[PDB]
Design a binder for this molecule. Sequence first.
Ligand SMILES: Nc1ncnc2c1ncn2[C@@H]1O[C@H](COP(=O)(O)OP(=O)(O)OP(=O)(O)O)[C@@H](O)[C@H]1O
Ligand SMILES: [Mg+2]
Lengths: 123, 150
Amino acid sequence: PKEVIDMEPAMDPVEFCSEAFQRPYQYLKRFHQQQNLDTFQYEKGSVEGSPEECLQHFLIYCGLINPSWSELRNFAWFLNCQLKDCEASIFCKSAFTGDTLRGFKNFVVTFMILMARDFATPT
Amino acid sequence: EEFFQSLCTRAHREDYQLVILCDAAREHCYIPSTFSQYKVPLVPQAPLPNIQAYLQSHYQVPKRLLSAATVFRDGLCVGIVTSERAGVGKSLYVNTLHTKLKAKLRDETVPLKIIRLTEPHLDENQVLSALLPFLKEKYQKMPVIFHIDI
Ligand SMILES: Nc1ncnc2c1ncn2[C@@H]1O[C@H](COP(=O)(O)OP(=O)(O)OP(=O)(O)O)[C@@H](O)[C@H]1O
Ligand SMILES: [Mg+2]
């Protein structure tokens, strides 16, 4: 993907409309710029993103320099399972009912970047 | 050698075009040594894009034929999906051509035969044995993609 982002979209769009790429991109798009994460995400549909922009976010947040597509797929699916577990648990519900829990999902996504660097990143 | 000698003794057409090609650095063996008087010192070679255009001109499937090649690069019947480093886009690309053959020519039911070749010193009997129960049937002469994976 690094060699078709300077020369040449490239990612398969059936993966772009998949849940497994869209939910991590719907969090990383709101996470790149420092927007507030209080409002709820994943309304089960694709937001206005492009394959170029979500490819660029996955290239800049996976950590390693020249990845293959398997490694970005593993990174995105790991973030998918973790944010799906974050959406299935009641900590976002208790954040909605308590209103002093917020800002914890920046910690959540950053610490999955570190654990994902442990799991899905040699070199 | 003695059989070629027998055929040139008995009876043969004297307009025949027999060409032999051997590795030049393996000359101490039998057949390039005992045919050395018919040595042709030019070694005919064509350039690369001429060979590419020749093979592509014969691989070009004509229209109105109901081929699976119409979802490849406008009917070329043979492709090779290669890459320098492994694990990038190849099998998903083959799957996108298979779903594109599912889109055009509706009511698809089209076979995607996958033939994983995973043994050293490639055995053609494996590929032949995987292909014999398949197009000896006459109802699978509908368009099928085959994906040999060396
Ligand atoms: N362009 C792409 N965009 C997104 N995901 C992709 C892309 N290409 C491949 N993938 C993902 O990568 C994984 C494996 O891809 P694929 O089977 O095409 O790789 P490959 O090049 O054939 O692999 P290998 O050389 O290991 O056999 C799958 O999960 C697939 O969804
Ligand atoms: Mg593959």
